[PDB]
Chain A
Amino acid sequence: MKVEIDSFSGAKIYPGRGTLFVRGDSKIFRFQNSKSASLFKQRKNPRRIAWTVLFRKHHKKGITEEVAKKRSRKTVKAQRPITGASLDLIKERRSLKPEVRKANREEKLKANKEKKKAEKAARKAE
């Protein structure tokens, strides 16, 4: 067995109890009882009918289901290596960042290097 769901009222339909209807477009409806069935043939709207589950959930009655939506308070949390970076040495270079004299000496090296570069280039142009 199964316990299906009325099209109109939205009520559990235990086996045998109730009717089934098959419209020309092959849509299969179920009705627990002739109340729901007769109303359907009258072409009523369940959102307008008061005792139906559809009205209940559209007018927000018995709303103890929902509370709120959760949110995670953090970051991706993965400072992993790039397969060519040696994560150990990566943290090592982060610690090597203070006393930044290396890049300063590289700049001082490259400054005199750029000097001699322009010098020899100007010499060749003459």
Chain B
Amino acid sequence: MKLNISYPVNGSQKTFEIDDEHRIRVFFDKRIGQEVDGEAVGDEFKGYVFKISGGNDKQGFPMKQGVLLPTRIKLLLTKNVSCYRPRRDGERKRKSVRGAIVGPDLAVLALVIVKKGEQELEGLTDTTVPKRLGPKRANNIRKFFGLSKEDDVRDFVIRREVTKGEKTYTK
């Protein structure tokens, strides 16, 4: 199996190709949102604790939260719901999915970190990806920065410099 682990503050993410079948029997019989032991999967993650975000089983059908069984089932999905995008308003559709309990049928299990332990991780904590966009709203800037009611938000804006030739500009 594989562990797609992520650190959301740093915004970092990495896949780990796992073996040691008894050190993954611990992962067995676990639901989504449940938290299992970092040391049991790996002493590199000793002391750490994750949260089971989701995962893909074989034949690529994802894990949906909330179904509360392990075997795969066919649901009449709709908009505002995982694992189906509608190509028309009103379009419902029957699709097959896998449910919210963990078992041998899975192939990749997606995890997120909630606490950082004592030692350090290569690809998660030493790096940090930036905010791709800056806040486009006045008050979003105002509360994110804490300025005032009247301090001219137009000039506290973010400015992202890029060069066309030698002419550079913030757009």
A82 and B131 contact, CB distance less than 8 A: yes
A77 at the interface (CB under 8 A from B): yes
Q: Is the interface of A mostly helix, strand, loop or mixed?
A: loop
A85 and B155 contact, CB distance less than 8 A: no
Residues of chain A lying within 8 A (CB to CB) of residue B133: 82
Q: Is the interface of B mostly helix, strand, loop or mixed?
A: loop
- Give B145 Cβ to nearest chain A Cβ, in Å: 6
> Given contacts A94-B145, A100-B151, A107-B152, is CB(A81)–CB(B8) below 8 Å?
no
**B interface, how many residues as a size bin?**
20 to 34
Residues of chain A lying within 8 A (CB to CB) of residue B145: 93-94, 97
Among candidates A76, A81, A100, A106, residue contacting B148 with C-beta atoms closer than 8 Å? A100
Map CB proximity to A onto B1-23 as digits: 1 under 8 Å, 0 otherwise: 00000001111000000000000
Residues of chain B lying within 8 A (CB to CB) of residue A84: 158-161, 170
Q: Report A's interface with B, CB cutoff 8 A.
A: 69, 72, 76-85, 93-94, 97, 100, 103, 106-107
